[PDB]
Design a protein around this nucleic acid. Structure first.
Ligand code: MG
Ligand code: MG
Ligand code: MG
Ligand code: MG
Lengths: 69, 100, 504, 230
RNA sequence: AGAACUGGCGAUGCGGGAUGAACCGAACGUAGAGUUAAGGUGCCGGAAUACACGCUCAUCAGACACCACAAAAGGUGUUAGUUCAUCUAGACAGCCGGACGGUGGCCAUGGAAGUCGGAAUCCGCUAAGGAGUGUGUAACAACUCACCGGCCGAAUGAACUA
RNA sequence: GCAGUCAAGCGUUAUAGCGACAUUGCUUUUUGAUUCGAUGUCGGCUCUUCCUAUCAUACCGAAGCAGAAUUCGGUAAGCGUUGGAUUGUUCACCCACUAAUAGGGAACGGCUGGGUUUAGACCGUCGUGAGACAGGUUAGUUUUACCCUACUGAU
């Protein structure tokens, strides 16, 4: 592998405006039964899949009190 | 496969032995909650269950991988990798086992 | 860079098609409306008919005339309850969507607002060097936006002139990290609590140390709070409450430079201490409890509040902005005499505290059980509400200056906006990609600024509940952000050893 | 019996009359027993015994050091303390892998006379939307059990490892043919999704794709380990 | 794995290494006598159950290739060394005696007095004595050992190397 | 496995470099919830013996081992270690009995079924075709012993 500064730069970035556009779009989609997926777009889906949850997960009680205590 | 079965047998013996604290009579539930802290009790048994599932997954995955081994060296490395991952999973259980 | 999908041929054709102009019809009839105060729920004027060609300004003036306080009118914002605000006029806000018509009566809830306006910060005024280590804390002067105090990990603090964005003073008394700084509500002294278990006081104008350090803590200082000016009798200087990792809250009388009271009820490190406006001290500690002490009862722990299952990381009061600002305002006008300062601070406290019948000072506690609790400690020992929804620990929490909104900054890369009265969830500010460390309101309660682990600041508009502007520029994690009292400058500092000043 | 009945029985009746002397003599004999075990145990038991003895001696030396060290006598904020944690690539040269090792001949026909099919014996990345070719035209075989979608990527800064999804295979050092087949071997440059690392450019853009180099042999250890190129 | 040089072997028997493609010695007419090489000299088996100084005892030692198993790892086997210390104003073992006072230090606990825990770990008097090394009590008590002294009287202990 | 941390040592007088034992992160996160490509060899029957890396039987050690039962371990191979179901596959899973239903070598460096089954035939895929196969189904003669030895018995 030759030394090259192409190895250390960013390959994919996304703007805040594009992030907000995709975040708002995910939720406006009404899936039709007669539409098939031909090609899925490559996106930061981990950043885009943010749904408000009405409840929190349980607190980690082992952080405050161990088994030995 | 044999090592995975041994670990799963030990974990199943643990999980079947201990009472289900939420299904016993409420007097026994309250007494055991006072004695052993039901939160810790259920969390430790859930840790055992999760370790059992992870060990089964490791065994299945590495048997499927060993299906394509080309040499004795590669097959030995895959088997050692499976057993070492099982050992890591089991050693993560050091505290719940002492508590239990 | 990944782009949004381009418009299709049909969309381009529809865009080329002529547009429709939204114009008020000349034959728009009259509609009946009822004004209702959001804070008090007192109906004014009964039901009155108004033409459909009303504006927000004319509706505001009409409400002032109905109240009978036309000589000094107070601005308002109107909404209809979904709860949709009136943007420009009633027709285009409600009648145009068709949800409320001219036949049906429209009940408009009105909320008072600020006469001044804070423009959003949009660019970095300056990047200033001088600190030898990471900046750990920062604060603005209450009287002016031209002075900032910043305590860092090089065992020093700095006083920065924000007019020229140049260093003005260096405070070099401590031996370890300056963990907290605090400007006095009268603006006369800066208190720095450090990692070497000491507290020092500094005259800012001379940039000097007022004698020796305040010693007595066995672990590092975790928070400093000041006694309110509106409770300090005129001719006297406010006292300094200080919490620390050793589980104690020490009260310091600074004129005599002595330690009077030593509250000791906590079994673990105290996360924060706050001096309220009714002679009370609220302490949140890692022992999963909130302790309420009375200074008028020799510092005794009046209340122990236990609802969290983990450390309470932070706590905020409804009157926090007023107690920090004392007798000053957004104009920066100084009182003439200490009696005038005490009376003006009393009025500033009362405007936020005593509304809708009886004075209340709500508290919010953000914990490590991913939740917050909303309490009214004077009235009941039970929490008013439990705010849940955050996936990770709630690191910071803040009441708005008017006390009507609560903002929580969490480690799940999010900020949550909640109603300040009943604690009901309103909205989620998303856009940070790392944990949000702390947050700060603007003076007019319309804008919010947050600093994150992702090396960015973000300014959010509370009214539209969406991102206003994203400010990069820091080379590393940002640890502290503050907004000026007059709403002109924002200071930020973190691991890059630089102070960033931002302005519109 | 109920509760601590053995402790109560010892409290009420004592122990056996020779218990203390018997325990004392066993503890005295322990030194001879340890030496006899070390010189007499054979095979796996002897190896394990020696290993445990070495570990015990190391632990005892550490305890003595700690006692003597006790007897001789990052600048985080308040909300973060008491909370714990050239353009040269790290592998410029790796072992060369021939086509003979990379591929396995797959014979077809009733008498196994045709040998045009090849099977890739290493792990591969196929990407999104992969559909197997029809078997009549499937020359190169990438078995589904050897396909990979995620890798343990280590960031050199801040010293963390995250399970990240793979986006593409940028360069296999063995051959561009292996690059376009998606072979995942040691030294291969891959593209990884770094959305959860929270990286932001100086211009404000969120970085969600970067390069990493594979540092292990996934065909040997069952997993892909990679180091991010920062 | 790739280059360059040089040997050995095929075409070659003989002595030795138990046995043998590449190891040691030595190359070949038919014989006699003598001396040797490599290897050996308890018996098989020709030749000292020679001489000499040491080491080792293996509940399947070793008589070997000097590579691996091998972590220069484990061992209260044994031998020889190296460097540190203690010592007749008394070395190591052993027995006896002392091992105190503020003080049951603060918090916590139904109880917690050095010895369930969390933080201090200071002062006095000492020849010496921890705000305690362990056993023990529900808590105390009691015993211990950390340290000191009396009797005894001459070398001893630790860590490494081979 | 990869990437680190620590440091008993090793090395050095340049506080470089190797580095045992430990240890962290990812794989894998909390309330015990709820089958994915083995490209070339396999199974039986009868019957013998060996190994121990011991499932049971014998004797022991430890364990909150009261008793009963069970778990971990030591010496130990003398003696046993089964009957069945499933061919739309079993590189095994179930049911039961039982003291127990341990693992393995002497093949995998005599009958018998799957497979090295050639000539017949059909279907599928590819080929302009002769044909070949990603394949699927069905039918398809190899038959010593009186020799030596070994073994069992007999002069
Ligand atoms: Mg002779
Ligand atoms: Mg071996
Ligand atoms: Mg054995
Ligand atoms: Mg045929």
């Amino acid at each position: 592998v030759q030394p090259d500064r192409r190895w250390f730069g960013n390959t994919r970035v996304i703007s805040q405006d594009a992030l907000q556009h995709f975040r708002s779009a995910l939720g406006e989609t009404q899936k039709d039964t007669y539409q098939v997926l031909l090609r899925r777009n490559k996106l930061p889906m981990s950043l885009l899949e943010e749904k408000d949850a009405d409840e929190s997960p349980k607190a980690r009680i082992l952080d405050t009190e161990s088994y030995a205590d | 496969k044999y090592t995975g079965e041994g670990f799963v047998e030990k974990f199943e013996d643990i999980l079947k032995g201990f009472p289900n604290i939420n299904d016993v009579h409420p007097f026994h539930r309250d007494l055991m909650d006072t004695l052993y802290e039901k939160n810790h009790y259920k969390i430790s048994l859930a840790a055992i269950s999760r370790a059992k599932s992870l060990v089964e997954q490791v065994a299945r995955d590495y048997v499927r991988l060993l299906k394509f081994g080309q040499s004795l060296f590669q097959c030995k490395q895959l088997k050692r990798a499976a057993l070492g991952r099982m050992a890591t999973i089991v050693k993560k259980l050091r505290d719940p086992l002492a508590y239990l | 860079s990944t782009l949004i999908p381009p418009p299709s041929k049909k969309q381009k054709k529809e865009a080329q098609l002529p547009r429709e102009v939204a114009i008020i019809p000349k034959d728009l009839p009259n509609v009946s409306i009822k004004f209702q105060a959001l804070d008090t729920g007192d109906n004014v004027g009964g039901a009155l008919r108004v033409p459909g060609a009303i504006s927000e300004k004319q509706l505001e003036e009409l409400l002032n005339q109905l109240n009978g306080t036309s000589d000094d009118p107070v601005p308002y914002t109107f909404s209809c309850t979904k709860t949709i605000d009136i943007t420009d006029n009633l027709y285009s806000s409600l009648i145009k969507p068709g949800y409320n018509s001219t036949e049906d009566q429209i009940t408009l809830l009105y909320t008072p607002r600020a006469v001044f306006k804070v423009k959003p910060v949009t660019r970095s005024s300056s990047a200033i060097a001088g600190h030898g280590s990471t900046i750990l804390c920062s604060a603005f002067a209450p009287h002016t936006s031209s002075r900032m105090v910043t305590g860092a990990g090089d065992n020093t603090a700095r006083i920065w002139d924000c007019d020229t964005q140049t260093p003005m003073h260096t405070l070099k008394g401590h031996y370890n990290w300056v963990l907290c700084v605090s400007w006095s509500p009268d603006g006369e002294v800066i208190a720095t609590g450090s990692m070497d278990n000491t507290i020092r006081l500094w005259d800012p104008k001379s940039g000097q140390c007022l004698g020796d350090a305040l010693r007595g803590h066995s672990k590092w200082i975790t928070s400093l709070s000041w006694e309110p000016i509106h409770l300090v009798k005129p001719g006297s200087k406010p006292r300094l409450a200080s919490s620390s990792k050793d589980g104690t809250i020490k009260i310091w009388d600074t004129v005599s430079r002595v330690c009077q009271y030593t509250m000791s009820g906590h079994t673990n490190s105290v996360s924060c201490v706050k001096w309220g406006g009714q002679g009370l001290l609220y302490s949140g500690s890692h022992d999963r409890t909130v302790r309420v002490w009375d200074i008028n009862s020799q510092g005794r722990c009046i209340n122990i509040l236990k609802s969290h299952a983990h450390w309470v990381n932070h706590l905020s009061l409804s009157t926090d902005y007023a107690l920090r600002i004392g007798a000053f305002d957004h104009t920066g006008k100084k009182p003439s005499t200490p009696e005038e300062a005490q009376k003006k601070a009393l009025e500033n406290y009362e405007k936020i505290c005593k509304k809708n019948g009886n004075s209340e000072e709500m508290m919010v506690t953000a914990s490590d059980d991913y939740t917050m609790f909303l309490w009214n400690p004077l009235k009941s020992t039970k929490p008013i509400a439990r705010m849940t929804g955050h996936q990770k620990l709630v690191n910071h929490v803040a009441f708005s200056p008017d006390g009507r909104y609560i903002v929580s900054a969490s480690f799940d890369n999010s900020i949550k906006l909640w109603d300040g009265r009943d604690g009901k969830f309103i909205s989620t500010f998303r856009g940070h990609v790392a944990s949000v460390y702390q947050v700060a309101w603007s003076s007019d309660c319309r804008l919010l600024v947050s600093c994150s682990k992702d090396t960015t600041l973000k300014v959010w508009d509370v009214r539209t509940r969406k991102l206003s502007v994203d400010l990069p520029g820091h080379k590393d994690e940002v640890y502290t952000v503050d907004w000026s009292v007059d709403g002109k400058r924002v200071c930020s500092g973190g691991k890059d050893k630089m102070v960033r000043l931002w302005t519109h | 019996p109920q509760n601590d009945y053995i402790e109560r029985h010892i409290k009420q009746h004592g122990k056996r009359l020779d218990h203390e002397e018997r325990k004392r003599k066993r503890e005295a004999r322990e030194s001879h027993k340890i030496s006899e075990r070390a010189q007499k145990l054979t095979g796996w038991k002897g190896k394990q015994f020696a290993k445990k003895r070495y570990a015990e001696k190391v632990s005892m030396r550490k305890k003595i050091k700690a006692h003597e060290q006790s007897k001789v006598k990052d600048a985080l904020p308040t909300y973060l303390l008491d909370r714990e944690q050239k353009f040269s690539v790290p592998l410029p040269k790796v072992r060369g892998i021939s086509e003979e090792e990379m591929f396995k001949v797959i014979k077809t026909g009733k008498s196994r006379s045709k040998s045009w099919k090849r099977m890739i014996t290493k792990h591969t990345f196929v990407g999104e939307g992969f559909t197997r070719r029809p078997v009549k035209m499937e020359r190169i075989i990438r078995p589904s059990a050897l396909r990979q979608k995620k890798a343990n990527v280590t960031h050199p800064e801040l010293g963390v490892t995250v399970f990240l999804p793979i986006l593409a295979v940028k360069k296999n050092p063995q051959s561009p043919m292996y690059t376009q087949l998606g072979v995942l071997t040691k030294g291969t440059i891959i593209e990884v999704n770094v959305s959860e690392l929270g990286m932001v450019t100086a211009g404000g853009k969120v970085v969600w794709g970067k390069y990493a180099q594979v540092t292990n042999e996934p065909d040997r250890d069952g997993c892909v380990n990679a180091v991010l190129l920062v």
